[model samples]
Target: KVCRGVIKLSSDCLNKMKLSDFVVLIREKYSYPQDISLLDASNQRLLFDYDFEDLNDRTLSEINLGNGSIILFSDEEGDTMIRKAIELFLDVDDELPCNTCSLPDVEVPLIKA
Candidate 1:
């Protein structure tokens, strides 16, 4: 039972890759792929909308650069615009982190910083 997001490979492709040796039971899971290297990797079975929020006021600029106050300054619309800009910027680098589209990653570089 190979539970993966990308499994549209044809039978020939699978066989060429030696994957046809096993009975391929292609199944899909609405969840993030696992990283076995991370010992405590997320193994959450439930796929729900995750809210990655900052307790304090966190701006797209502050998060990427590791600088920001605890008071949220932007309103809902403003926050969304900033988040979208970050998404476009990151997409250029081929980054597909789900949170990147809605919330800034803590490690990415901020334009302000």
Candidate 2:
């Protein structure tokens, strides 16, 4: 039978979404993998991947707010691949915010993908 009731998100997901402000996170080894290939032409740098080491904790109240909320997660690891390509095209560190404010035109040649 289809359960018609409330569902809650794990505290881990709640705080992450908040701190990230609905932004996508790229970390070491899990979730978002850092791509450093775009950082330089020589390609001698560290790459970012899922760390899965740090899992921030959140209160029950916080997870309650996300109750019945739609949260989608995937292990496909394809979207990250695309972003990695994006990083390569842009030539910026995955750890750093990809802000266009201070970068030159050489970084982002086209706005639209």
Candidate 3:
């Protein structure tokens, strides 16, 4: 049966929603290969043994995967793909705590007191 779930691995070393739909979405987005596997980054193993369409109905946590979990995209060229993506994520991650302070704004107004 089709199940409802919440998952989105937009950034590398990050995190899936559907099996086939999700993969194909990412595949087209990044121009990734048609034959790629999603691995559980937590345990370093494949998410499912079945092929593309087999796990299409089975969703994120239905396979024992939880919310905000990381999944590694695996394939022959995954090494290069994941690495580049991870670096991009890291760059964005590092910007989180930054604050652009110390600049003073002029309080002067056009209206007379």
Best by TM-score: 3
- Candidate with maximal lDDT: 3
Give Cα-based local distance difference scores for all models: 0.19, 0.26, 0.40
> Candidate 1 at residue 6, lDDT?
18
lDDT of 1 by residue, 1-113 (tens): 11112122322222232211111111002111111010101221111112322212332222221111111111122221221111111111223322222222222221221
What's model 2's lDDT at 47? Answer: 19
TM-score list, all predictions:
0.15, 0.19, 0.46
What C-alpha lDDT does candidate 2 achieve relative to the native structure? Answer: 0.26
Model 3 clash pairs?
A: 9-15
TM-score of structure candidate 3: 0.46
Q: Which residue ranges in model 3 land beyond 4 Å of their true spot?
A: 1-16, 48-53, 77-113
> Candidate 2 has what TM-score?
0.19
What's the residue-level lDDT of 17 in candidate 3? Answer: 44
Q: Which wins on lDDT, candidate 1 or candidate 2?
A: 2
